[PDB]
């Protein structure tokens, strides 16, 4: 079929053209990310594969953009925080790597090693960016030895997968392991930067079957309904119905977040009895989430969203909905 052929062709095009200049490389990555997002929008079965690959390519694009910003960066005391987006890039790669690890199904270990390798790259980038700012030596030593411990744990866990990671960041890092162990933090940061820039883009082996974890809140619906009244101080129960697609263990992972119009946020852990399983890879969540707040002058709207949890930390995976509540006193 043409969709799979196009997907494989685009990925091969990205992999082959890794000798380009940074501008050409990042514009090729942007083109391919846009193409994969559109292909995910069109096809249903290849939405998972397209979004998985596009997330990986977005991680790589953020990494190379941050390294070009580092090329734009200069000596440490002259560093400007407002104009830098490398730390934001590292955080974004962090959250996207979590997304590929957990928010997709059918992920074999051969993809988990690549996800963790990109995670290690993001941690190295965050370490380097922090070193660009911090004038303290003790915190720098602390984060440096933490990163080296993370590298060691990666080497321990994925020891059987290292031959598949030729010319990678972690491979070259493991080559010069004891020197990094016994070097000064500033020297470590410098060689880490140089090795990040010279690292090779690892191929992402596609799984045979993979689907994105999706959820659809359907019971509250649009805000055309009248506000829920008489809630001042006491509780109002909002019935939540949702269809969850391709979540193997939703009970321990799916959570319900409620965001009131103030900064307060509520986190809810539904019991397994709420989840129903009418079909394979297609759950049905029915439950009540209890909301309470003081009296309001005007009927504001409260945002209710479904999140996935991983182990800590959480990531949203459902479209937010809003419902109006008028907690009138009496």
């Amino acid at each position: 079929d043409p969709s799979q052929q196009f997907l494989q062709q685009s990925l091969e095009r990205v992999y082959s053209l890794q000798h380009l200049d940074p501008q050409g490389a990042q514009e090729l990555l942007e083109f391919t990310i846009r193409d994969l997002q559109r292909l995910g929008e069109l096809q249903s079965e290849l939405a998972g594969v397209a979004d998985f690959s596009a997330t990986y390519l977005r991680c790589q694009l953020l990494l190379i953009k941050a390294l070009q910003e580092k090329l734009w960066n200069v000596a440490a005391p002259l560093y400007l925080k407002q104009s830098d987006l490398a730390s934001a890039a590292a955080k974004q790669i962090m959250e996207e790597t979590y997304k590929m690890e957990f928010m997709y199904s059918g992920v074999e270990n051969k993809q988990v090693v690549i996800i963790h390798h990109m995670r290690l790259q993001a941690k190295a980038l965050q370490l380097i960016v922090t070193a660009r700012t911090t004038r303290g030596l003790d915190p720098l030593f602390g984060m440096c030895e933490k990163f080296l411990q993370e590298v060691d744990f990666f080497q321990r866990y994925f020891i059987a997968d290292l031959p598949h990671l030729q010319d990678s960041f972690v491979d070259k890092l493991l080559d010069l392991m004891p020197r990094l162990m016994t070097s000064k933090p500033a020297e470590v940061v410098k060689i880490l930067q140089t090795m990040l820039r010279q690292s090779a883009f690892l191929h992402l082996p596609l799984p045979e079957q993979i689907h994105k974890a999706s959820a659809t809140i359907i019971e509250p619906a649009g805000e055309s309904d009248n506000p829920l009244r008489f809630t001042s101080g006491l509780v109002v129960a909002l019935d939540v119905d949702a269809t969850l697609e391709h979540v193997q263990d939703p009970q321990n992972t799916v959570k319900v977040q409620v965001l009131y119009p103030d900064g307060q946020a509520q986190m809810i852990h539904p019991k397994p009895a709420d989840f129903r399983n009418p079909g394979p890879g297609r759950h049905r969540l029915i439950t009540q989430v209890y909301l309470s707040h003081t009296a309001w002058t005007e009927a504001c709207q409260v945002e209710v969203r479904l999140l996935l949890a991983y182990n800590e930390g959480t990531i949203p995976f459902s479209k937010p909905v809003k419902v109006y509540i008028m907690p009138k006193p009496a």
Binding site: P2, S3, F6, R13, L17, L20, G24, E27, L28, F31, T32, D35, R38, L39, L42, Q43, K70, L71, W72, N73, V74, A75, A76, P77, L78, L80, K81, Q82, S83, L85, A88, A131, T134, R135, G136, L137, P185, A186, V189, K190, Q193, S224, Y260, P261, D262, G263, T294, A295, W296, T297, E298, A299, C300, Q301, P329
Partner: protein, 889 residues
């Protein structure tokens, strides 16, 4: 007020005379531009829809025109059901014209009502109507709804297919029906079925009109679906090569240009080879020009890297760059330049000089014509030369020599364009400036003797390259320029623009002279104050050009003189500030320039403070043993850190500024941070001096000579500090020597006034209307909604675009920051809205402040919008007050 004007129109629509009603209806869109908030838009659209329901057909057409004009504001209607239902009631009229207008309105409203089943059924029923106007309106509405909703597209594709293939349909309606198929991209199987249908159409209806519409629709469908795009390119190349009709070939060229612009990465080597062969073996020049336009579009993208010896592309480009046709020559030389700068492969360096000589020959061809097509080709050639000078710097000398030789034998418009090219090349590579000064000065002398009308632009262009090309100051060239201005030029505007350029490149004595000359020419007093302030700033910057390398007393005197003139200038500039021209960036920029100069003066004083000896009581027991100088260095460090913070504040309050101005502000902030770091690492904390000054950029690609000078000063100061880290105790004269020398180095490079100091281009704002001396009960906490629209002037996203809006709300009592909360909201059609919840548990008076911030596409946060405040009078309710009083009593 919004509602007053809306009533003013409403009495117009209620008059009953058709003229007044139509007048009001077409007066509506200006109201939306004045008041883009959903309350007015909602009420306006409801009454417009009522008038549509009851009005005659001409009024309905006026309402349709208004709806088409205001497709941005219809996301803000909110009350969609009533509006649409009272619009939709006219589809049941027996009048086919009224039905057609209703169908066109539904097509115009398709974005806010997709998946509306009654509308879908109306389109389907009107498609097989017997009234041609109704059928055309149904086709238009079907196009819109297929663009919006997937279910309508899948439900309509079969019917559209049967009407197109149906023998009873005329050819004109078949033409009108084919572009519906470009919206069948919602699903892979739907797109494949549409592709098959379009293939059947091109093979079975090979008329010029029908094949053109079908191929264009197939191209758009392939672009939207981007899975059939390779074989769509192959099909277009097949039609380009085989079909003999010039119109079909021209369409194929346009479609391939569209695909090259959209998806250059999907082009294979075989596709580019086929296109090159087609360009090679075609006899017609217009078609060849079209294919070379496609190939020049491709060469500027990554498709050139995918294409890679002497191939058909290089052979074609070399053949085309010596063509008689100027457009073909421009496209060929653009392809050659793109290959040369993008591909550093050493197998194709023989065409490096072919590119240079082709550009030079194209200069000779385009210089004398002074025609708009020739001017366009000349602009293309000069852009290519600028790109080639950047990409291959060893060719810069030959490019500059060609431009200089061609300057003496070119028309005035051509001379202006090559002056722009020379300015670009000399801004990026200032080493070539010295080699071009003689020719430029000679041409400036000969132009100024007979400068009548068009030479004013030539004069400012020539002065711009003179100032840009001059790495150092001017002594005799300055005299020549002043003489040329004073001899003939009564045009004050020319003098002002040349002075602007002089202050841009730091030639502040010339700028001072010209601004002094420009006084008494203006009529308005605020412009007089503005020019006087510019003259004083130029004088102030000229004052500190006479800084000796080690003379600190001379430095202190020069900074004092500069500060005197700067204070005169800022008083004048404040006098020049007016409403709707506040000069806020200029005022803040020169205020931060007045600071960091008196901070420099204080640091010069503290250099000399070391000569006033420390006390003996403190001298008997590490940094306190220094005495007063230690605390003074601490104060100076804090002052410079605060100055860097203020420069950053100016940076992120300059969302509308061009990139060069922002880089200038960054340089000033970095100079502040450099002085602060030097003070810290030499006096206050040498043990915590952190890592070495390992410049990640190294040989950074500076965009101006001011950038190069600033970074060179920074690197030299950091090298000096690093070599002096722990070599001396903080009582040292060498630390003060290094600091004072850093002051000298920073000040000896003249300040550059950038574009935003003079020209404001983007001018984006926020309206920020928020729902309201307002009484709030103690128990009931306020529900505050803030709505805002981002405003623009002319081209909205000239430098950057708003990605999201951050709304920070804070509450200060007794008008202190008791209600911090933020909400990043994405403005959809330049409009955002959100609700806030504000606690007022503590009784009293509360000052609510809301400050809009802008997060651009990259992610940088800008503090743009107004910090508008409202005051809230929070009082305990009578019920709780009475109950507590009774309980206590």
């Amino acid at each position: 007020d919004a509602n007053s004007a809306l009533m003013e129109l409403d009495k117009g629509l209620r008059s009953g005379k058709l003229g007044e009603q139509c007048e009001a209806v077409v007066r509506f869109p200006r109201l939306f531009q004045k008041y883009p908030f959903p309350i007015l838009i909602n009420s306006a659209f409801l009454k417009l829809a009522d008038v549509f329901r009851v009005g005659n057909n001409f009024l309905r057409l006026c309402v349709l025109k208004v709806t088409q004009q205001s497709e941005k504001h219809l996301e803000k209607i909110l009350n969609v059901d009533e509006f649409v239902k009272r619009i939709f009631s006219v589809i049941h009229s027996n009048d086919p014209v009224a039905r057609a207008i209703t169908l066109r309105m539904l097509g115009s409203l398709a974005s806010i009502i997709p998946e509306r089943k009654n509308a879908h059924h109306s389109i389907r029923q009107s498609l097989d109507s017997h009234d041609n106007v109704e059928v055309e309106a149904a086709v238009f509405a079907a196009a819109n709804f297929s663009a919006q909703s997937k279910d309508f597209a899948v439900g309509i594709c079969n019917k559209i297919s049967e009407m197109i293939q149906g023998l009873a349909t005329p050819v004109d309606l078949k033409l009108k029906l084919i572009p519906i198929l470009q919206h069948m991209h919602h699903d892979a199987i739907l797109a494949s079925s549409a592709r098959q249908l379009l293939q059947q159409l091109v093979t079975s209806y090979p008329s010029t009109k029908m094949v053109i519409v079908s191929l264009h629709t197939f191209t758009l469908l392939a672009a939207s679906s981007l899975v059939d795009t390779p074989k769509q390119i192959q099909l277009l190349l097949q039609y380009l090569k085989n079909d003999p009709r010039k119109a079909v070939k021209r369409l194929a060229i346009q479609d391939l240009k569209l695909l090259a612009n959209k998806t250059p990465h999907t082009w294979s080597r075989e596709n580019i080879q086929a296109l090159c062969e087609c360009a090679l073996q075609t006899p017609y020049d217009s078609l060849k020009l079209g294919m070379l336009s496609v190939l020049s579009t491709l060469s500027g993208t990554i498709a050139i890297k995918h294409y890679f010896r002497s191939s058909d592309l290089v052979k074609l480009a070399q053949e085309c760059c010596y063509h008689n046709n100027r457009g073909i020559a421009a496209h060929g030389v653009r392809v050659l330049t793109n290959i040369t700068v993008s591909c550093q492969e050493k197998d194709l360096l023989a065409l490096e000089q072919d590119a240079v000589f082709g550009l030079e020959s194209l200069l000779v061809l385009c210089s004398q014509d002074d025609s708009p097509g020739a001017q366009a080709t000349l602009k293309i050639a000069l852009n290519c030369m600028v790109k080639l000078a950047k990409g291959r710097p060893h060719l810069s000398q030959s490019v500059v020599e060609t431009l200089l030789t061609q300057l003496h034998s070119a028309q005035d418009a051509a001379r202006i364009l090559m002056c722009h090219c020379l300015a670009a090349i000399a801004m990026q590579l200032p080493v070539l400036g010295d080699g071009m000064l003689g020719d430029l000065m000679e041409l400036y002398k000969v132009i100024g003797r007979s400068a009548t009308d068009k030479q004013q632009e030539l004069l400012v262009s020539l002065a711009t390259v003179i100032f840009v090309a001059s790495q150092k100051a001017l002594s005799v060239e300055s005299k020549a320029v002043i003489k040329q201005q004073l001899e003939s030029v009564s045009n004050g505007w020319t003098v002002y623009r040349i002075a602007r350029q002089a202050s841009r490149m730091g030639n502040h004595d010339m700028a001072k002279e010209l601004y002094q000359s420009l006084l008494t020419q203006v009529a308005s007093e605020h412009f007089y104050f503005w020019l006087n302030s510019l003259k004083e700033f130029s004088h102030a910057e000229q004052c500190l050009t006479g800084l000796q390398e080690e003379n600190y007393s001379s430095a202190l005197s020069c900074i004092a003189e500069s500060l005197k003139f700067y204070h005169k200038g800022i008083a004048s500039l404040t006098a020049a500030s007016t409403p709707l021209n506040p000069l806020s960036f200029q005022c803040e920029f020169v205020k931060l320039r007045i600071d960091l100069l008196q901070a420099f003066s204080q640091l010069i004083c503290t250099c000399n403070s070391l000569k006033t000896s420390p006390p003996p009581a403190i001298a008997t027991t590490d940094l306190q043993r220094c005495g007063r100088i230690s605390n003074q260095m601490k104060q100076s460090m804090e002052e410079f850190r605060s100055l860097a913070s203020r420069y950053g504040d100016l940076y992120q309050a300059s969302f509308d500024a061009d990139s060069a101005t922002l880089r200038n502000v960054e340089l000033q902030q970095q100079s502040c941070l450099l002085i602060s770091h030097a003070i810290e690492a030499l006096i206050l904390d040498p043990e915590s001096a952190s890592f070495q000054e390992y410049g990640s950029t190294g040989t950074a690609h500076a965009d101006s000579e001011y950038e190069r000078r600033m970074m060179s000063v920074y690197n030299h100061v950091l090298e000096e500090v690093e070599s002096l880290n722990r070599k001396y105790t903080p009582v040292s004269y060498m630390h003060t020597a290094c600091l004072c020398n850093a002051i000298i180095a920073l000040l000896k490079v003249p300040l550059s006034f950038q574009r935003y100091f003079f020209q404001k281009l983007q001018s984006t704002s926020i309206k920020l209307a928020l729902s309201p001396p307002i009484a709030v009960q103690n128990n009931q906490q306020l529900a505050l909604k803030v709505e805002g629209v981002v405003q623009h002037g002319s081209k909205p996203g000239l430098f950057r675009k708003i990605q999201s809006v951050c709304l920070n709300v804070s509450s200060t009592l007794q008008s202190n920051m008791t209600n911090e909360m933020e909400q990043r909201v994405e403005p959809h059609n330049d409009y955002f809205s959100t609700q806030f919840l504000l606690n007022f548990a503590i009784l009293g008076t509360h000052n609510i402040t809301v400050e809009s911030s802008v997060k651009d596409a990259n992610g940088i946060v800008w503090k743009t919008g107004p910090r508008t405040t409202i005051f809230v009078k929070s009082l305990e309710d009578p019920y709780s007050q009475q109950i507590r009083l009774q309980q206590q009593q």
